[PDB]
Amino acid sequence: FRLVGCALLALGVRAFVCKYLSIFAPFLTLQLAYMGLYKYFPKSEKKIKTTVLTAALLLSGIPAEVINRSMDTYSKMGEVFTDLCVYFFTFIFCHELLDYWAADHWAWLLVLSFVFGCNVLRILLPSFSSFMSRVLQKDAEQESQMRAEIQDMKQELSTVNMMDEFARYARLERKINKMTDKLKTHVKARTAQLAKIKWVISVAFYVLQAALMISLIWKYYSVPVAVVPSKWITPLDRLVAFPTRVAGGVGITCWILVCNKVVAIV
Amino acid sequence: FRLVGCALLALGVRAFVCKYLSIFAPFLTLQLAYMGLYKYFPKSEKKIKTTVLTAALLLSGIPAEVINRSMDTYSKMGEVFTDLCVYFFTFIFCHELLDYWAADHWAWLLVLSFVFGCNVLRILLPSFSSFMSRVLQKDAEQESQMRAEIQDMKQELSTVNMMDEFARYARLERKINKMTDKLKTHVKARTAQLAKIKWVISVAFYVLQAALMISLIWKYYSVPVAVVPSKWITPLDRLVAFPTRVAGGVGITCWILVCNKVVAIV
Amino acid sequence: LEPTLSNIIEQRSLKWIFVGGKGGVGKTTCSCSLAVQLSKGRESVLIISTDPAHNISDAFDQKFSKVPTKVKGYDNLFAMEIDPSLGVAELPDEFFEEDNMLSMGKKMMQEAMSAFPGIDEAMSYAEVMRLVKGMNFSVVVFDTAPTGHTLRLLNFPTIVERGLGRLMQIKNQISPFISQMCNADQLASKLEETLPVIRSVSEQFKDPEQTTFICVCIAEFLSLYETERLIQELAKCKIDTHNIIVNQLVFPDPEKPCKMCEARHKIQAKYLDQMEDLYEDFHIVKLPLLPHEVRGADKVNTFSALLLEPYKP
Amino acid sequence: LEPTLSNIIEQRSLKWIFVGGKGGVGKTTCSCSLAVQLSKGRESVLIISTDPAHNISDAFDQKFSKVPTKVKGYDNLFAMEIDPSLGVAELPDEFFEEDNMLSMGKKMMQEAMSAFPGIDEAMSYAEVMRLVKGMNFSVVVFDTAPTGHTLRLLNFPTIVERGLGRLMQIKNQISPFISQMCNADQLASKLEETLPVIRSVSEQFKDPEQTTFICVCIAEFLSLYETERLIQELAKCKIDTHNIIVNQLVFPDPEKPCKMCEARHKIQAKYLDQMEDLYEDFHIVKLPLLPHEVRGADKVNTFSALLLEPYKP
Ligand SMILES: [Zn+2]
């Protein structure tokens, strides 16, 4: 349901796109969030599920209400951060539109292409999972034969009696149980191997994308990227003007965060 | 994953927004869909789940492959219809933007307000479910007392032995089973009542929104709504110009379909 | 109440008599003697054996098959052993495990176009029922297997019923669609001729006046508890049950010949006191223990005689 | 192999002897006689009774409690009845039903801040184990209840173990966070003093050289099948089992006094042939049936004597 509010806020931002009648642009977002909270006041549907990390902190004596408010305000600041990010994205959109009717434009296009490429490669990593799908196919024949053996043993046990020949019935039941336990162990081993492979490939992807990001920063740390008049976004201008008095290293994380958010919650 | 393609197509459309260099605007969408299909060719992830309506049609002798192609092309035309809808929405956006730098504008705003109001009322119908939440609270006391009775019987049965007093143990087990069966019957009755109430309120909502829609048509059937130059969207202009040579009754269903799609798949 | 099985014999409206009970109890001999006793009053009795060990073959020292065959020494009795019954009753183990009301039909259709193993079960069961009803037997005595319960199977195809009702509802819509876009008949056919017999037998099963269940146990906590669970499960399915028969009773003579006879008698006395306290609304048929040398038709006749009238030394 | 229970007595490395078995078998008398026999070789024996009917009280015609109390007529034996054991073993029925490896800890914590009923079970069990280990008994003989199995409970807190390991891992991170944003100790404390005894007893349970299980059954298909299932479930949990004791055996004399004695002897002979064929790697202890007038300490001594050396008339 949170994405419903995100979409409503995004359509509101796109309605206020490139609108300079009101100087207080981030405040416009503040009342957007206020309206969202007012609408959520009778529509506060949420799902809380038990996790593992919270167990240790609960055992540390922290009050449960304190932990609940911590997590829900953490969520709240998460979506307000994403919403401010898309707000800045729409302001950039206004900027190149007024430019249409300029190294900033090429820088914007290049950083956009880089972030979309990283994100699509991350999302097609499951398509890159063929290198382990081949091992799955290799083990498939073993699994098939050793389940055919299960079926043969089960039908043979169904053939034999149970009253006057309990010895053979019990021995065959023992064999069936042992082979099914072996099947479960093999399945769990396959699952663990796949999970470990996914984890290691994911951390490799994270390190390579971090290297690409830092290379992009070293390339464009001394180059202006997103130039806006100061008094337009002056409440937070000093924060966004991290490198060389321009919207740089905050813009990059805005782009990557909003793209990851949309392609994840999508 | 389908919403990923929808978002990619939407961002492509918004990249081609208000771009009149190429006359073949719907074709631009045609190659958009072609690129989507080409990208999905190695990325055709889908989930097919067994339903009830397909059972009767499978029992009617229709080949399974025929049914699969029927359903997947039905899906495909569904998303291409939604994508053409958002394409027309972006063209309208271009139209009022060029108007910014006009009864069509008030008509657009009014139909938008009507469709958003209908959709938000439909989505807050669960908040309107208080009229049956009160009945749930009314039955809650009965449920609580008759589960407390279950707990009392269970603990008393745990107290009694089983070997030397099997008669009392079996009688108490019978009573516990009967009371738990009564609990299950009451729960199923509550679920059926709630489902029937939701169904009847939903059909009432559908009929009232249909009445509102047809009233809107009777109000604006003879009034132009969305005026565009013919040669811009001329491949499908004759279809969209349903009333009085203007984008009317197709525009309304575009708006309602895209809004329902976003607020449902959201 | 009554320590005999005369209520079954005097109820001439019975048409499906089941004899259940798990464990080491010799319930096949009890059911065969019940069928022998029934043969004295009815015009034709059938004995269906769903057990895999073919016990009624040894009881009558004859060889039976999947068709009803006359047993020697009797003019009304017929016997039949159907291993296909257990073979097709093992298959719905998944349905028994889930026992749902919406998804079991989904599973059945999924296996239908995946492996087709369930509608084949329905055909086999319908064929057995059609043979039973076409030979026109007055009563049929089932020897249910000690493991499993195929009686509930008849309550499953109700999902098939309302699915076919939805099929009839969409019948007027598929034909115009078929004409718009343009074997089919054999499936709906075989469903149409295999449904009515299933419905007749299922309606007869739920009728207490033409279907009864006799639970066979012995004087012991384990068998008593198993039969209590069986009775509770049977009543949960709305299936009549009125008689239980206890086997391997000792009944020592007043001569006090053996200490161990009185020890076992005390144990069994405790268990029967528990049973009678629990089952005041049942018919407790106490069947003693017969000699090892008395095996075959003689023991069947003896058990039938003791079923007709109570045994007390 | 061997028809006696001497392997248990001669194994002086045993410290946890469990006596299991469902049904109507008089396993309490067998376990009490085993404890009496053990008292002749060890320095101190304890008899824990987890059954609700308090059978060892009737066996020794004494009244016991939740603390170890000297039994009359013996100098080494001690007895204790702990109904709290079954009271806290009924509670983890949900964990027994699921028997998962990831979500059971989630359920335990959910009930912990919702009702706190499970850590209380852990404390009760740890207290019982601490009392047992602090009184320093050579051997402890458990009379496991005929229904349920609390032995697997010790394998559950491994989720608690690695959760506490993650707690130690995040210990260096919570404190700086606590300083940044700014009872706690009692929970981690009671966990820290209730874990080691649980781990000691669980490690002793899985060691075949200091933990054994004796399964008690009778010559019958139902009890034989129940004990076969019990043995399979016990082996699935990697728990040692080497002896089974069959009760209520007749052993008729060659005088042929009663026909029913030989009939029951034939039935039991079939069942024991099946058992010995199935259990060539077990110790089959055949215990006969004692008089009804022989009840109490005399029957306990008789069963102990027949456990030490095989009985054959
Ligand atoms: Zn005798």
Author numbering:
A (entry chain D), B (entry chain C): 191 to 291, 1005 to 1169
C (entry chain A), D (entry chain B): 24 to 205, 214 to 344
Please give me the paper's original passages concerning this structure.
Although the resolution of the membrane region was still lower (4.5–5.0 Å), density for both the intra- and intermolecular disulphide bonds and for bulky side chains within the TMDs were more clearly defined, confirming the register of the original model. In addition, a model for the ER cap could be derived from an AlphaFold29 model of hsGet1/Get2 and docked precisely into the corresponding density, allowing it to be incorporated into our structure. Our model shows that the ER cap stabilises the heterodimer interface largely through hydrophobic interactions with the luminal ends of hsGet2 TMD2/TMD3, including aromatic stacking with a conserved tryptophan (W135 in hsGet1 and W137 in ctGet1) in the cap. Nevertheless, the structures of the wild type C. thermophilum and Δα3’ H. sapiens GET insertases represent analogous, alternative conformations of a largely conserved membrane heterotetramer, which we define as state 1. Accordingly, the conformation of the wild type hsGet1/Get2 heterotetramer, where helix α3’ is bound to Get3, is defined as state 2. In addition to these conformational changes in the membrane heterotetramer, we previously observed that helices α4-α9 of the hsGet3 TABD show large rearrangements when bound to hsGet2 helix α3’ in state 224. Within state 2, the Get1-CD is re-oriented relative to all structures of the isolated CD in complex with Get318,19,24,35, suggesting it occupies a strained position. We now show that this conformation is governed by binding of helix α3’ to the Get3 TABD, and is likely further stabilised by phosphatidylinositol binding at the heterotetramer interface. To investigate how the human GET insertase affects membrane morphology, we performed atomistic molecular dynamics (MD) simulations of our structure of hsGet2ΔN-Get1/Get3 embedded in a lipid bilayer of varying lipid compositions.
The eukaryotic guided entry of tail-anchored proteins (GET) pathway mediates the biogenesis of tail-anchored (TA) membrane proteins at the endoplasmic reticulum. In the cytosol, the Get3 chaperone captures the TA protein substrate and delivers it to the Get1/Get2 membrane protein complex (GET insertase), which then inserts the substrate via a membrane-embedded hydrophilic groove. Within the membrane targeting stages of the GET pathway, the homodimeric ATPase Get3 (also called TRC40 in metazoans) adopts closed and open conformations in response to nucleotide load and interactions with other pathway components, allowing binding and release of the TA protein respectively. However, the cryo-EM structures and native mass spectrometry of hsGet1/Get2 and scGet1/Get2 show they form a 2:2 heterotetramer, which is stabilised by Get3 and interfacial lipid binding and is important for efficient TA protein insertion.
